[PDB]
């Protein structure tokens, strides 16, 4: 199988950081050859599960989410969508490519938006436990208020990954809106932190995502019993987890963007997965 030779003295991306200081790749266009990666993942018959919550009104976001995932997400690989919803009948029946399936998991609806967002960790954890284990190799956990606009593939796959929050990738850490109160399990001292990861897109092997979600859930319970809610809820706890358990890949903001709020800067060669306007 024949492709351009990587040249040691002529890096493709010179404008951005492409590896973290613990040697995890930062995934940007021009750092990867998808043909090589597709072959590596196909030879293992990799199955990717994608979890998405659509509780109450967010069922309205599923049709575009799913149609655009069919176009752009892991195309050519085996995919299992897990749609968590309080309204199984409102899931649109989208036609899927071969080797792709969708399961609907009915769950309860929490009243507050915070708890719906926060209780995802518990629900991914869940107990949807020996089920994710037998069914898929990797789990990808995303917001439903989104659409795919370009390739999201096996380049993201790794034991544990997070995604750079699009409104903080160019900032310094004291500007990061981590939880700064030490009463919270989510507390990160002001002199600490690598990146600000966004809550809408994380994943990894099933064992690592279960660890993560179990820890974030146990940490959120400790805070509740202590009468505190972290400033950005699950995102706060995700950031704390990924500080202490560093991801083995970091996705660039190509993988989580909002063209309406942020435009299309030159540093972004593709906008792959983006926010859909809402109230
Ligand atoms: O009433 C709700 C509130 C939240 N969510 C889920 O939790 C995610 C996070 O909430 P949201 O996207 O509202 O937060 P934002 O990204 O706007 O900060 C959503 O994408 C949905 O998957 C849901 O299904 N129904
Ligand atoms: O600072 C953290 C916050 O930043 C905002 O831009 C975003 O809308 C929130 O969802 C949260 O991520
Ligand atoms: O406020 C908490 C929320 O933060 C948003 O930025 C993120 O997209 C959501 O997944 C949720 O974590
Ligand atoms: Mn969202």
Distance 199 CA to ligand 2 centre (A): 9
Distance 220 CA to ligand 3 centre (A): 14
Declared resolution, Å: 2.2
DSSP-assigned states of every residue in 185-241:
TTB--TT--S--B-TTEEEEEHHHHHHHHHHHHHHHHHHHHTT---TTHHHHHHHHH
For residues 137 and 260, the answer to whether their CB atoms sit within 8 Å is no
For residues 80 and 103, the answer to whether their CB atoms sit within 8 Å is yes
Q: How far apart are the first and last CA of the chain?
A: 48
Ligand 2 atom nearest residue 235's Cα = 12
Residue whose token pair is 């892991």:
74
CA 37 to the chain's CA centroid: 19
For the Cβ of 120 lying below 6 angstroms from any atom of ligand 3, the answer is no
Q: Which residues constitute the domain of residue 270? A: 1-279
Distance 8 CA to ligand 2 centre (A): 38
| CATH number of the domain enclosing 236 | 3.90.550.10
CA-nearest of 175, 174, 176 to 196 is 176
81 marked ligand binding residue: no
DSSP-derived secondary structure letter, 56: G
Experimental method: X-ray
Quote the CA–CA distance of 185 and 229 in Å, as a whole number.
Answer: 10
Query: What's the domain count of the chain?
Result: 1
Burial (CB count within 10 angstroms: exposed 0-12, middle 13-18, buried 19+), residue 276: middle
Of all ligands present, the nearest one to the C-alpha of 200 is 3
Residue 235 annotated to the active site:
yes
35 marked ligand binding residue: no
The protein residue with its alpha carbon nearest to ligand 3, atom 12, reads 199
């Amino acid at each position: 199988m024949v492709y351009p030779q990587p040249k040691v003295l002529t890096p493709c991306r010179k404008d951005v950081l492409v590896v973290t200081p613990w040697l995890a790749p930062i995934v940007w266009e021009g750092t990867f050859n998808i043909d090589i990666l597709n072959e590596q993942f196909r030879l293992q018959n990799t199955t990717i599960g994608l979890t998405v919550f659509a509780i109450k009104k967010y069922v309205a976001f599923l049709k575009l989410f799913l149609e655009t995932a069919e176009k752009h997400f892991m195309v050519g690989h085996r995919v299992h969508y897990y749609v968590f919803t309080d309204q199984p009948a409102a899931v649109p029946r989208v036609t899927l490519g071969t080797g792709r399936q969708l399961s609907v998991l009915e769950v309860g609806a929490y009243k507050r938006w915070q708890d719906v967002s926060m209780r995802r960790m518990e629900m991914i954890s869940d107990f949807c436990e020996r089920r994710f284990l037998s069914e898929v190799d990797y789990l990808v956990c995303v917001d439903v208020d989104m659409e795919f606009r370009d390739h999201v593939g096996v380049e993201i796959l790794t034991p544990l990954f997070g995604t750079l929050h699009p409104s903080f990738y160019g900032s310094s850490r004291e500007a990061f809106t981590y939880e700064r109160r030490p009463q919270s399990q989510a507390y990160i001292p002001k002199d600490e932190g690598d990146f600000y990861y966004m809550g809408a897109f994380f994943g990894g092997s099933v064992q690592e995502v279960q660890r993560l979600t179990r820890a974030c859930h146990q940490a959120m319970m400790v805070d509740q019993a202590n009468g505190i809610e972290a400033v950005w809820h699950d995102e706060s706890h995700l950031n704390k987890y990924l500080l202490r358990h560093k991801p083995t890949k970091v996705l660039s903001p190509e993988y989580l963007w909002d063209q309406q709020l942020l435009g299309w800067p030159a540093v972004l060669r593709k906008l792959r997965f983006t926010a859909v306007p809402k109230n």
